[PDB]
Amino acid sequence: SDAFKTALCDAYKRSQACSYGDQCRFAHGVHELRLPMNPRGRNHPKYKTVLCDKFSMTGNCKYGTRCQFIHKIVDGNA
Ligand SMILES: [Zn+2]
Ligand SMILES: [Zn+2]
């Protein structure tokens, strides 16, 4: 990354006064801040939202991969 605006200004945050001022290679705000944009794709994206009742009762769900419900192998014997 380039030396400009990829990190916040330590002098501006702690001391407020910055030695270079507006010629500071660091950002004096979030609008000034253009950091190296790392992917935000970390959160869990669920197609299958609620548990599958058919897969829990009969052990089988007819939709399979199409199922909008979570196929969880539930322990316990009848
Ligand atoms: Zn600065
Ligand atoms: Zn299912």
Curated annotation (Swiss-Prot):
Effect the entry attributes to changing residue 52 to Y: In ne-51; disrupts binding to glp-1 3' UTR
Knockout or disruption consequences: RNAi-mediated interference leads to maternal-effect lethality. Expression of glp-1 in all four blastomeres including the posterior EMS and P2 blastomeres, instead of only in the ABa and ABp blastomeres at the four-cell stage. Abolished asymmetry in neg-1 expression in AB descendants.
Described purpose of this protein according to its UniProt entry: RNA-binding protein that coordinates cell fate specification and differentiation during early embryogenesis. Binds to a consensus pos-1 recognition element (PRE) consisting of the sequence 5'-UA(U 2-3)RGD(N 1-3)G-3', where R is any purine, D is A, G, or U, and N is any base. The PRE motif is found within the 3' untranslated region of many maternal transcripts required for early development. Binds to the 3' untranslated region (UTR) of Notch receptor homolog glp-1, thereby repressing glp-1 translation in the posterior blastomeres in the embryo.
Covered residues, full protein: 97 to 173 of 264
Gene name linked to the record: pos-1
Taxonomic classification: Eukaryota, Metazoa, Ecdysozoa, Nematoda, Chromadorea
Quaternary structure note: Monomer.
Annotated compartments: Cytoplasm
Official protein name in the record: RNA-binding protein pos-1
Chain residues that bind Zn(2+) 1: 9, 18, 24, 28
Residues involved in Zn(2+) 2 binding: 52, 61, 67, 71
Superkingdom, natural source: Eukaryota
Zinc finger (C3H1-type) in chain: 3-31, 46-74
